[PDB]
Nucleic acid binder design. Structure first.
Lengths: 162, 98, 112, 94, 59, 53, 71
RNA sequence: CGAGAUGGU
RNA sequence: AGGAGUGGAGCCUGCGGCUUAAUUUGACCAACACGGGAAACCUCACCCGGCCCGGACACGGACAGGAUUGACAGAUUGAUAGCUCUUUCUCGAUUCUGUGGGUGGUGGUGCAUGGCCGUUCUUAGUUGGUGGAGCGAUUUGUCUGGUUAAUUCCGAUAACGAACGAGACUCUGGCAUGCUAACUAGUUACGCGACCCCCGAGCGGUCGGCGUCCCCCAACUUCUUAGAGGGACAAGUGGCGUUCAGCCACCCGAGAUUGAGCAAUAACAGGUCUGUGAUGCCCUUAGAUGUCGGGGCUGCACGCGCGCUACACUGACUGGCUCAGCGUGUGCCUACCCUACGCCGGCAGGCGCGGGUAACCCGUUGAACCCCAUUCGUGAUGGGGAUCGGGGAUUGCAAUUAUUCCCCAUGAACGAGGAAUUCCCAGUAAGUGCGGGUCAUAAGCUUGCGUUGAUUAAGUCCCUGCCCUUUGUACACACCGCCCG
């Protein structure tokens, strides 16, 4: 960068980078139980911290997938060689994370389990984990050619204000 | 012809050395970036990697106008043969992480 | 697009009598006819252009959709028995009826 | 005028090779935005219309106009009677 | 920074709008010291998502 | 293979398209975003924009 | 979004003619060689590659945009 | 205590 | 009760109808300056023509005196498409060819779906558990009365104890000579220094007047920025209230209703497959429903919707004087930004040479109406500026069916608008100009900002509607219902 870019463009471009990285990781690590990414900078080096429920699947047999993911993140975003490091981290209290519960319900439905048996299965596990309340919704062609929806609810739930 | 054999070897040698490939979905840009300088277009990279996927020798992913490809064990076996390399080589990734 | 009746009842799917209205001619067992009178009960009196008058009936698919009227031009299916009676298959617009007569398909009897 | 000189070559070929005291054959073209130069007078051109070529005999009074100004892209309108929906009172009830 | 957009994806309905914004905050501090010790103090507590930049002469 | 296989695309709606989904209509050029208006309402929280008023 | 009305000057592609491989060399005596058609005066194409003979031209098929002599 | 019928999608 | 209007005129722009090779298409309070929809090409889907494979992979065939690739010249063609025809060089296992199978699609279905958005509906509404009442659908809780913007409170009580919406909450406006502290912000003052005036007690001065004239290694934070805290509670006084809950006036005070965001349960055959690598089924797939050249989306007897300019003297024209606030700025593929100063030209514009990645440069952002002086004289007039002739610049690959801009000339209807009908309660309506979006070129639209600043109300249920209760019914497709001769 022969002359530096203005602060308005700099702060918008840094947000556009985090959005595309989160989309790539979302669809690579879906069955592997992904739930978020965090990124931090230090002189000559960028560290990316990645949260999942089954961290050994993020690593692979001897760390193969961490080496493959380090290579493609560097290759696509234009970092220089060796300035990027990826660290996998285990999710605390996985019953209180909405993304891990939406993905595990998706794979439970995709395996052919019945809709109400699946939905009360996650509704129990969220409330046993110590939430104050929850709301699960499924919609589409549930049983027949005309569309429907189901609400499952327990405990407290606010809708308005900050 | 799909491409000159000079181009086809230069894609496979870069894939075998690095262990991964990345390209954008645009057939019109005249050169692929990085070590595919010295004249091959990214149209040849897309068409080469598609032919390698339908044999089972690479995995594929896609997000926001970019392809991502990863080499796999049957593809390592096929490329080491095609490039005539010694049977002991594995140049891309080997050392166990901590 | 434009309504041409007026009511609450937006509850249907729109008629779209448009675009690829590909022109239809006779097969075996069919005739072109002009409506002479309309009766009650979903039935009508029609004359075909070779001169045999018939009592005629609206098929269940055309009910409360393709509104027929006096002097209108229609396609009719004949019965192999009970030759006095027949059923309506199509209505032609005044734009299609002139194309039938331009292809020489109708005798010079039909009004447009 | 990169490769727009090709029309002027075909026009001067047709002016050269015509029988003495008789009109050239047509040269037919898509180039509607060509300016009439004084080289082009007394010449036959077919100018494309979106589906057909219309022939023009280039009179010297045409100088400085475009070739596309003499070959028109549409038919002049003449009306048939108004249809259903043309006015608020025109409504149909079965 | 401000962006104002129609809410609808398709152009139907009564004509409502969304009003998005982002705010940016900036500060300056000046020191009287050797070039060797700004490198020490400009390295602690900087852990949150804050930009820090330093220039060797401006005063 | 042809030598004339493209036309100039250095300005107008032929030059530019969305960075997420390749669409050409209703895109935002402000502050260097280059997203489609429907893609912006989808990613605004991750980019860091909020609404207050 | 319609049925298609067909053109009537129909070809798929042309057919490329088939001929035996080599007639640009002659043996005239035991150990005597002649070259029947000439190389073009050139940097890369200066040996083992030949100009066509047409009825009024000599042409290099390798340097195909150029290397034409008018006799 | 003016006059106020009717109903393809 | 009133204000500014709209409906009447000219023009702009969206829709129907007509016309056409095509004038692509969705939508009929809750469609019509709406699809961020300002189409020269592209966008592009429509219409007339022509190249191309970007048909993976599997099986079989053909094939190193060779599978196949590319092309000069002449004819041909809109064309410098080796597209095709004649000719005869070239490349090297990458293709070709038959069968199976894929792949792409702004193709079809929004009445097969997801996601998002609109609307019922801006109002105060909605629901379990245990207990009571009925054979049952159901019901009470969730109320006779008072009170409130409010299913908000008081209280009553076969119910008790809870959940969501309301409110709280978040951003914003108005106050702090108190705090923190500034060469990318200022003031005051002087060591002083410099130009101009004598108008001034008095000289041409220490001392006076004027300054975006210039240093400070002077002092400071009132004016600017922006962090932390403070402040308002129906808290005080007088009336009225089943003396409770509350309501009205007034003192003191910057201030005794500032304006937005977010928002429940249950619905609609509402809109969107043309936002998407969201997607089922159907269609098409080498003479393609997957790229270039030209045309159309602008066509004009006619009906309708949102708007701009006006009918003049409370004005128009020509000079002079003097005041804003919100923002944007060198494009990361993609190749363009905002401009001071000097010179040439009536003007639009041109050349040179500097600053700005921005509290630093354009910039003290010399804005319009308004303000002061002049000319016209009740005349379709020096009001109004449609329509149309001739010439000159700028963008662009290309300006004709006129891109936008400049100049001289021409000089329409229109004299406050029939039956109807929209929006609005205070820094508001209306007047007036300036930024942002879209943008190579360009607002009569839309989304924000400042400036000048009223008349009329402090109410009612009459008209059109909404909430709650009692009541009647032959309705439940729910009055746009059902039904008789």
């Amino acid at each position: 960068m022969a002359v530096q870019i203005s602060k308005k463009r700099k702060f918008v471009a840094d947000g556009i980078f985090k959005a595309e990285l989160n989309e790539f990781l979302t669809r690579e690590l879906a069955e592997d139980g992904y739930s978020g990414v965090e990124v931090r900078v230090t002189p000559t080096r960028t560290e990316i911290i990645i949260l999942a429920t089954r961290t050994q699947n993020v690593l692979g047999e001897k760390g193969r997938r961490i080496r493959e993911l380090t290579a493609v993140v560097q290759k696509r975003f234009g970092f220089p060689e060796g300035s990027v490091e990826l660290y996998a981290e285990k999710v605390a209290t996985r019953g209180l994370c909405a993304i891990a519960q939406a993905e595990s319900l998706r794979y439970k439905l995709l395996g052919g389990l019945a809709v109400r048996r699946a939905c009360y299965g996650v509704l129990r596990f969220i409330m046993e984990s110590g939430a104050k309340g929850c709301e699960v919704v499924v919609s589409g062609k549930l049983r027949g050619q005309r569309a429907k929806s189901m609400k499952f609810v327990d405990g407290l739930m606010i809708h308005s204000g900050d | 012809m799909l491409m000159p054999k000079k181009n086809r070897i230069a894609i496979y040698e870069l894939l075998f050395k690095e262990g991964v490939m990345v390209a954008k979905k645009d057939v019109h840009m005249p050169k692929h970036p990085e070590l595919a300088d010295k004249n091959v277009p990214n149209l040849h990279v897309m068409k080469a990697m598609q032919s390698l996927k339908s044999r089972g020798y690479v995995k594929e992913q896609f997000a926001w106008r970019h392809f991502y490809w990863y080499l796999t064990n049957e593809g390592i076996q096929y490329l080491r043969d095609y490039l005539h390399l010694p049977p002991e080589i594995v140049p891309a990734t080997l050392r166990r992480s901590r | 697009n434009k309504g041409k009746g007026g009511k609450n009842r937006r509850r249907g799917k729109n008629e779209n009598e448009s675009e690829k209205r590909e022109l239809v001619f006779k097969e075996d067992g069919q005739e072109y006819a002009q409506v002479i009178k309309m009766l009650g009960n979903g039935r009508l009196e029609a004359m075909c252009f070779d001169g045999v008058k018939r009592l005629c009936h609206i098929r269940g698919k055309l009910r409360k959709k393709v509104w027929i009227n006096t002097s209108d031009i229609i396609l009719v299916g004949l019965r192999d028995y009970q030759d006095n009676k027949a059923d309506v298959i199509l209505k032609y617009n005044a734009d299609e009826a002139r194309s039938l007569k331009a292809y020489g398909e109708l005798p010079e009897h039909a009004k447009i | 005028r990169r490769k727009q000189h090709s029309l002027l070559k075909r026009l001067r070929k047709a002016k050269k090779e015509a029988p003495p005291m008789e009109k050239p054959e047509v040269v037919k073209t898509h180039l509607r935005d060509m300016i009439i130069l004084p080289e082009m007078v007394g010449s036959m051109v077919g100018v494309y219309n979106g589906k057909t070529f219309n022939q023009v005999e280039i009179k010297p009074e045409m100088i400085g106009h475009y070739l596309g100004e003499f070959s028109i892209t549409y038919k002049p309108v003449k009306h048939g009677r108004p249809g259903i929906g043309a006015t608020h009172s025109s409504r149909f009830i079965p | 920074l401000r962006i104002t957009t129609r809410k609808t994806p398709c152009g139907e309905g009564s004509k409502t709008w969304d009003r998005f914004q982002m705010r940016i905050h900036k500060r300056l501090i000046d020191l009287h010291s050797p070039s060797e010790i700004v490198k020490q103090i400009t390295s602690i507590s900087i852990e949150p998502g804050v930009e820090v930049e330093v220039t060797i002469a401006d005063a | 293979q042809q030598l004339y296989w493209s036309h100039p695309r250095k300005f107008g709606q032929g030059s530019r398209s969305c960075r997420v989904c390749s669409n050409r209509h209703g895109l935002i050029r402000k502050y260097g975003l280059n997203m489609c208006r429907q893609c912006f309402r989808q990613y605004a929280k991750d980019i860091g924009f909020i609404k207050l008023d | 979004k319609k049925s298609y009305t067909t053109p009537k000057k129909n070809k798929h592609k042309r057919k490329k003619v088939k001929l035996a491989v080599l007639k640009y060399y002659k043996v005239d005596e035991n150990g005597k060689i002649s070259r029947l058609r000439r190389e073009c005066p050139s940097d890369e194409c200066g040996a083992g590659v030949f100009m066509a003979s047409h009825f009024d031209r000599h042409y290099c098929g390798k340097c195909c945009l150029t290397y034409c002599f008018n006799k």
